[PDB]
Design an enzyme around this catalytic site. Structure first.
Site, mmCIF file in Angstrom:
data_model
loop_
_atom_site.group_PDB
_atom_site.id
_atom_site.type_symbol
_atom_site.label_atom_id
_atom_site.label_comp_id
_atom_site.label_asym_id
_atom_site.label_seq_id
_atom_site.Cartn_x
_atom_site.Cartn_y
_atom_site.Cartn_z
ATOM 1 C CB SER A 42 -64.916 -13.278 15.353
ATOM 2 O OG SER A 42 -65.486 -13.810 14.161
ATOM 3 C CB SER A 205 -65.680 -7.700 18.835
ATOM 4 O OG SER A 205 -65.650 -7.517 17.440
ATOM 5 N N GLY A 206 -66.170 -10.689 19.239
ATOM 6 C CA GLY A 206 -66.748 -11.932 18.741
ATOM 7 C C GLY A 206 -68.223 -12.014 19.063
#
Length: 260
Positions: A42, A205-206
């Site tokens: 993401s 963030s991911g």
């Protein structure tokens, strides 16, 4: 040294760390496995949002987009409420950046013109590394034997700089996007938790489904300095099922910031 600290962190957390940091004022860089490929997950929502904001003025983000039942994919806490309804481009970007809504990101890619248009934009930016192939949520099916939906820390960070921090966004669209990243509901345990007190962090963030792939990218603003430090931290582990530990990213960020 920073390299020794990051090596010790790899061992402490039994994980792989990729770091690229660029202080856009001084040009100083920090690089650690910066040319190794990771799933970006993401964190790419920041890229897709910026590409859309390059081609839609702020006052035209009221454009409405209709949401059907079949558009909803996993982890869409905002867009699952819009089935059979209209949502504006502004509300799509807000959902994608603030809450990491996956359907919102898919509709943003569609608005841009699809995966092929994203790839064309990356080539124009001189990014021949970042490799979008799939939509949500399939882009989170990371495998070390595959380059699909991966990038390197250095390539992703240079692209973030060229699109956002030192891109061509309008004043209103840039402030809109950065404020979303300052204020998002998903980043508190990552870079934001690791930087010293007098920095302000705009992050996205991911987390991929596999190999404990856990990332954070950010524009880090020192107090009294308008030029950001661009920070990309990608991490993963050797086994498909492992679960990430967010403290790895926090401690990596704390280590990297000692260089600036």
């Amino acid at each position: 040294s920073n390299a020794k600290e990051l090596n010790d962190l790899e061992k402490k957390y039994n994980a792989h760390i990729g770091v690229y940091a660029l202080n856009t004022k001084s040009g100083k860089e920090v690089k650690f496995n910066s040319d190794k490929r990771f799933a970006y997950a993401s964190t790419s929502k920041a890229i897709n949002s910026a590409i859309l904001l390059e081609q839609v003025p702020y006052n035209k983000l009221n454009k409405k987009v209709h949401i059907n039942k079949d558009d909803i994919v996993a982890y869409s806490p905002i867009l699952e409420k819009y089935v059979g309804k209209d949502i504006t481009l502004k509300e799509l970007i807000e959902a994608s950046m603030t809450y990491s809504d996956n359907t919102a990101n898919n509709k943003i890619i569609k608005e841009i013109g699809g995966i092929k248009k994203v790839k064309q934009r990356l080539k124009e930016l001189g990014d021949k590394v970042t490799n979008p192939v799939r939509y949500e949520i399939e882009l989170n099916y990371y495998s070390p034997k595959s380059k699909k939906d991966t990038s390197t820390p250095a390539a992703f960070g240079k692209t973030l700089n060229k699109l956002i921090a030192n891109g061509k966004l309008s004043k209103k669209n840039k402030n809109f996007l950065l404020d979303l990243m300052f204020n998002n509901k998903n980043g508190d345990t990552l870079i934001k938790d690791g930087v010293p007190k007098d920095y302000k962090v705009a992050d996205k963030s991911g987390q991929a489904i596999t190999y404990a792939s856990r990332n954070d990218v950010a524009f880090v603003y020192p107090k009294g300095q308008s030029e950001p430090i661009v920070l990309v931290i990608f991490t993963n582990k050797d086994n498909k099922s492992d679960k990430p530990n967010d403290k790895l990213i926090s401690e990596t960020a704390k280590s990297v910031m000692k260089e600036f």
